[PDB]
Amino acid sequence: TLDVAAQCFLNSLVRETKDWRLTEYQPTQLIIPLGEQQALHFRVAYFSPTQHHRFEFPARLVTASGSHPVDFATLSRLIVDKLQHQLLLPATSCETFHQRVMESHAHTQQAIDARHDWAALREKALNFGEAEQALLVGHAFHPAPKSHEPFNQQEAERYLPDFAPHFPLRWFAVNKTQIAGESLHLNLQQRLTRFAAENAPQLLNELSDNQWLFPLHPWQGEYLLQQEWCQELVAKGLIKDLGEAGAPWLPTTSSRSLYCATSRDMIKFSLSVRLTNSVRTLSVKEVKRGMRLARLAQTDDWQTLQARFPTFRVMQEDGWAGLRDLHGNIMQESLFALRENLLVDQPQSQTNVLVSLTQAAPDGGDSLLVAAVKRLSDRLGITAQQAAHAWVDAYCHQVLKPLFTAEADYGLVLLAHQQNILVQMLGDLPVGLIYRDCQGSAFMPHAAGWLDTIGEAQAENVFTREQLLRYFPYYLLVNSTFAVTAALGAAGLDSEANLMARVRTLLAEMRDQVTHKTCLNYVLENPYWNVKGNFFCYLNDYFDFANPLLAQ
């Protein structure tokens, strides 16, 4: 009756198309014409003004003769055929698209079947690791959010968060000639030594002045070792495989970022896998973004920002390393970034990634957000609606405020979608924010003088005003705030319209306080936002979105 994987495909499509209808009569049905006098009739259980819809399955294909049910595989192929014919697309690109969609759908079902614990997650507050592996639906507005090529099923069970696995890292003993890297506070030799001593102490027999301990992802590790350039190093004895060892690491929502509860650092690997339309290798350019922001976090003006927003943290990526071939070429498939584990002293703190809270429950029950809101209602003795309002209000103050204000007053841009936002909670109420993913950092023109303080003002990741107004509202509101409000709306705690009214009101107060009102004005006043459409972007290996926050 329900299929959260199919809903992704359909909500992604409905958001990015103007061609679909609603029936005047009840029960309401959404209609996607296929042309040639036939159309798909979806029964609507919940209609969302932000297109967080929920359809009651199976769908029905309507014909001249009559009507008949169709499975997802069928209705999806009829849609890709339609788009191929009306929009005149290539054939080889449309079939590969449909194949990848079906793989994802199928992979989402296996993970649902495998995870019998998921429902029990509603029962109490989740820690960091629990939330990082609770996301089974994936990207709610991507057609194929769970494609993981080239991984097989055995590899997808060990190396993806979906099956809640854990594993020790792989380790090499590498000569320092063949180690490139960079790190703050501790030099590179000192990070690697600390990181090794706290995770795989028994390998410290291999540690010397020249021969350092190098961590690798177990899949990449085996994938790198076979390569000739790496095998050449083994021949010269500049690399020595130590195998797997040490503490348990669990893949996070991004799969390539790993978490260990006792390690002062998390580790983000260059991982040769396609995950929603991008191979997840790292570049030297990318890791220097993190190093850039990490150094900027030492300045006085950062000190001032942090003082003003003490409940707001950024998990700095202040270290990285990678292997050099025999020529000295940094092999980017061996790179990794080291990310501050700000939860190391509090591994049971209710700090959750937002995307896991807002995803629709695969069993059609409460979302993990709604669970938390319901606990908050019970604990405080207030109505579920009142608990919905308070949660939403605190979310604005704790999450949105520092993020808009970081741009407006300091020119710092943090592109914070659901998977980058960690909601620090205490008793299911947001009391802070931790931002993650420093590749999502950028700088406005009015941060240039501040960047000069570290010599970076010619930074690669500098945005123009037009770049800001494109990305920033989509990530923070469309791809964040409206999932919060939609999830609460789908559960019936309050209408999305009324909840977005609370968001609007608080964004207005926020505007009054900041210096550069450019962005908040665009958000609060401009009729149409740029929104990145994954449905047609993924089909090829941008649209205007009606702004709901305008004054009515």
Add this chain to the structure above:
Amino acid sequence: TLDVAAQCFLNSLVRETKDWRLTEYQPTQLIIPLGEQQALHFRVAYFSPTQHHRFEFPARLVTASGSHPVDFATLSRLIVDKLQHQLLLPATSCETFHQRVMESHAHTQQAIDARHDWAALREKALNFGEAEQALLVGHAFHPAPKSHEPFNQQEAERYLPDFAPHFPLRWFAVNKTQIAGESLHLNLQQRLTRFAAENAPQLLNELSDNQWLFPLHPWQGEYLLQQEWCQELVAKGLIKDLGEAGAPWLPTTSSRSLYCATSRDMIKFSLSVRLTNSVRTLSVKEVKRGMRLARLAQTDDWQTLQARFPTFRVMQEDGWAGLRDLHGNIMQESLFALRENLLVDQPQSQTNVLVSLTQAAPDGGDSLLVAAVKRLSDRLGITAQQAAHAWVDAYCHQVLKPLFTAEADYGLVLLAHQQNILVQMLGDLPVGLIYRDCQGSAFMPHAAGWLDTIGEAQAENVFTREQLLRYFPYYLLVNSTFAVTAALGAAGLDSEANLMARVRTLLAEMRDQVTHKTCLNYVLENPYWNVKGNFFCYLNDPSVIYFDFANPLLAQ
């Protein structure tokens, strides 16, 4: 050199008198004239515009063509003698006052010598229980904050928090015909069942339809049991003494209130002991106030208030019980009230009573507040002054905001001591408030329509305007907020003057958002605050009992 006990006697005095002077020369000294061409000279290490002074000892007697040092016992006797002449005081009350001040001074020194763990508390964030037993100085502006009467040494070691003790409760099996009480959600029979079950399960072999388990304070219980009316019940078989049993309980800052980390309920006993000019027995009257507030907490307007401030909690005292004699008369010395333990599900949270944090270190080191702020600074990588400002700003938003708004918008008066304020912290930053002691709850006239909804419009704890303006700014700014700013000022993180400017700014923002501006107007604009002193109140078990306090928040 250091005496935090003497500083209480002296600072309390300096606040309630205008008969003292500073030296135009340095090192600066504070002078208290004794008349007859003699005076006491105190070396001032820190001068506070909120009278949180730090004197360097010994003092010095300035007399005849010369002086000499005087111990605390001497200078205090001299000052009490001065007061006996000035106010024509009965000699019996003077000597009772002085002996009590020495008792407190001595008891404090004992505790300080007994608590070698105290300095180590600076090392990390405190849990609720740790903070509740970390107060060794007591009331900072009371002359005898550690008077224990009639506790002996052994009794003070076990039943006060100072030595960080714990003990299981005493228990009576009592016929329901001799149990008077009340409870919400669960009836009285059901509370005592739950409470007895989760605290002393092994006594459930004495639980029946008619015979209920009844908890007692080990010291009160031994006293009540030696009474005539109680033994009538033992002879009648309506009371059986089961002795001590069950989980460990910690006396908190108030001594009569106990804490058990695994207990869903705290318990606040009627305790026949004198602590800062009040016998600590309960009355049916006072325990009804808790019920009144608890029943009011089920209303939709409370619900509305709670929604507006989700991080603000009140620990509801929604249950109480006591013993009645054979004639059915409630014996107030047996009373207790049950308080919600909102920390039962996280006993290791950084929820601390404010008074323990602000308290000046007995060893002269960092106060526990300064230890926190310093951790806040190091974690966030910000300056100690930036951490101090951040902590103070969050204190205003998390503590002062809900309390001033509850009175203004809803008419609810919560008289928040430094001891009734639990600061819910997360990473050494205030992120919420938990208020304790419902005996200090009162209602303004404009709460009347709301009290009607539960039929308590004629509540005894109703306050006039003048009552509010006297009490509320004393408890919540003088005996609370200024202790925060003073602690940080004394540590040299920023001047009290500057920190009090921050509070004013935020208090002024708030006034613009409330309905009844009556209270915040007074705070910000009334030149003087007329309140009640502890030093001359304690000396007398009316122009002196209450004194005018120069407002430091006036735009100057």
Add this chain to the structure above:
Amino acid sequence: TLDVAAQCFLNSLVRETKDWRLTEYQPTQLIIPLGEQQALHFRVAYFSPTQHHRFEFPARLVTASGSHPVDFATLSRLIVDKLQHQLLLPATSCETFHQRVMESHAHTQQAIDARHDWAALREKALNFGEAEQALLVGHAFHPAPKSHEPFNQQEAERYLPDFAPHFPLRWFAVNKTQIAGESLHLNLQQRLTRFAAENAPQLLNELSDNQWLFPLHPWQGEYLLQQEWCQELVAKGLIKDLGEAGAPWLPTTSSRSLYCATSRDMIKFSLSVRLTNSVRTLSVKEVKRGMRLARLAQTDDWQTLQARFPTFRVMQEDGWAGLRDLHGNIMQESLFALRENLLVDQPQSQTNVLVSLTQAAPDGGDSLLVAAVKRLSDRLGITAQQAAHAWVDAYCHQVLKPLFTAEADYGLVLLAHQQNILVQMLGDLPVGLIYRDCQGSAFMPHAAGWLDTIGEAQAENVFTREQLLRYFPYYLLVNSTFAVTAALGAAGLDSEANLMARVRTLLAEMRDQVTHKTCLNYVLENPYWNVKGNFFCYLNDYFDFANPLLAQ
């Protein structure tokens, strides 16, 4: 290649028959003749003198015409067809037998597939709850150890240990007139009061002098509510259904017994479900046995026993309750027994039920027992064989000594198979015993004087010498000790023969210390043991066994 469910069926068969043979030539194959020049050949991977075999699959059916592979569904039909005519087995009975064998085989594979966390159990010492849900194979010598009629697949996932579920209890508020029961230390009213106050505190609003809180199994409670007699109680106002509430409970290896870490009591329910040829309802007679032993556990001679074996405890079932119909008749289907939770103060102790340790790994890897012995080896820096020896010797001293001695010196009989034996470990070495299930408690004639001290010398569960010698060695050696020695043997730590020699040598030393040597003499000297045919027993809704503990 590996099928642990099929191995239960086949080993159970080979143990209870003398019609099969072994091929001299290598690779060795076990042959089960079907007659008519037709037979099944099983490639043996491990031959066990205690019939804990491991066959390599698929099996191969051999005729004069040739050989071809056969799957488990086939070879099991062929074997039942054989047995059907060889025993003149009724056709309708045999069809039901094989249907339950395929159901068991199927449900097992579903559980293996569902439990992706099982392999990870090898990594560290298990706690009690983890072990209680680690048994996915079931009884290793029952033909259908995972048949759970009438449970459907949804009901199995929630109410059997197999999917590691947990849930809150169902609760009725019941007039004390309709409550039957008994308890020690606390009376019945007081136990139920305590049991409710620590497990479902929020239901205490319903508690009163006349209306008592009454716990139910979530399945059994619904099954009960629908019956006519219970409806009458609801109509009369004698019962009020409070629904589900309270702390989490996890079903143990027995399913009808539930475990809550925070509760001083475990609860054993009358459960109308068939688990290995026995519907799991309780009877009044059966819960008297627990009360009887509990009262006997308060005597001075029990004291004398306990002081001699301080590491040995029994989990006393010192309470029970049940509903009565309107006529005062105790309803057998509503019964439950309360059991001491002796682990309530150390929930993370390495106290594991033996059966989950000995069980063959579904994925063919190390057993959870061998996982421990290897930890023990690595910790002490001794050889795996030495650790195996130490573990076995420690098993004999901590488990076998107190149990034999209890019969010999006191006349107390505890029928301790693997599932009643909780091995108390410290650093993967046994250091104690906790016995469970007082239904398997009995008494010898020389215990009669001790029984007279509580007036229970007339007990129903008194054994004859013959009853003792039949049951005791099977449960306590065949279905306990030999699974340990066979798991260590199959792992290649040492031969079963050498490990069984260690057991004999210690049993010999034991016999010299006890007064009544009857039992140990029968174990050490009698050429044959009586043993249960769970196979032909299950076929029909026992047999002699060669003693390996003989001196040779």
